[PDB]
Symmetry: C2
Subunit: 57 residues, 2 copies
């Protein structure tokens, strides 16, 4: 990857981790409405990170 | 509550990150990745919307 590609990979890694952290926070709030969306959010973040990692990592 | 506001703000920060990463991927040759990021961003917008309705 170029430097720009690596910056995008790093940001995808960050969102993967940050979405896991927000999911845990919502689960502690027993905020089911939000945690339901957050789980799907984190799944897409994981998918994107793995996709970027394969390509530029 | 402090805990609720922490989660709302984190949702907003994730929304900003997902918009930023979708734009970066669109700027790169990254169709496969940008397609995923479109859905990722729609989820971050919906989570922020929902959390704002509840805790804003």
């Amino acid at each position: 990857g170029t430097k720009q590609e690596k910056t995008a990979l790093n940001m995808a890694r960050f969102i993967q981790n940050q979405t896991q952290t927000l999911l845990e926070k919502l689960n502690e709030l027993d905020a089911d409405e939000q945690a339901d969306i957050a789980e799907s959010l984190h799944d897409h973040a994981d998918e994107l990170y793995r996709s970027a990692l394969a390509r530029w990592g």
